[PDB]
C-alpha cells in the first residue's frame with residue numbers, strides 16, 4: 001500500500017504530465033515499441049510502423065497515447081481505490097487484446113523513463129520509487145483479475 005507521502009510524490013509528477021498528455025504518450029509508446037518490439041505486434045493499428053520517425057509522425061499513435069495516459073491518470077488519482085477503473089481495462093487487455101502482465105511491466109518501465117527525462121526536478125529517487133510502487137500496484141491488481149479469468 002502506498003503512503004500518503006508516496007501518493008503525493010506520484011501525483012505531483014503526474015500533474016506535470018498532464019500539461020502535455022500527448023507528447024508524453026508518444027515518447028512512452030515509442031520507447032515501449034523500440035525497447036520491446038513484441039509489444040508493437042499486438043497493435044493491428046500500429047504494426048505497419050517500422051522506424052522511430054514513422055512512429056513520431058503517426059497521429060493515430062499520438063491519439064492512442066492520449067487514451068492510455070488518460071486512463072492511467074484516472075487510476076492514479078484514485079490512490080489505490082481503483083477497482084471500478086480496472087475492471088474494464090483488465091477484461092479488455094486479458095480477453096480481447098491479449099496483453100501479458102509482463103508487457104504491463106514493460107510499459108511501466110517506459111513511463112518511468114520518460115517521466116525522468118521530462119521532469120527530473122520532480123522525479124528524483126524518492127518520486128521514482130513512489131511511481132514504481134504505484135505502477136506495481138496497478139500491475140498487481142490487474143494480475144489478480146487476469147488470474148480470475150484464466151489469463
Ligand code: HEM
Nearest residue numbers: 039042043045067068071072088089092097099103104107
Ligand atoms: C498503463 C498501461 C495501459 C493502459 C492504462 C491501457 C489503456 C488502454 C485503453 C484505455 C484502451 C482502450 C479501451 C480498452 O480497449 O480497454 C486500450 C486499448 C488497447 N491496449 Fe492498452 N493500456 C495499457 C497497456 C497496454 C499494453 C502494454 C499493450 C500492448 C503491449 C496494450 C494494448 C492495447 C491494445 C492492442 C488496445 C486496442 C487498440 C486498438 O486497436 O484500438 N495496452 N488500452
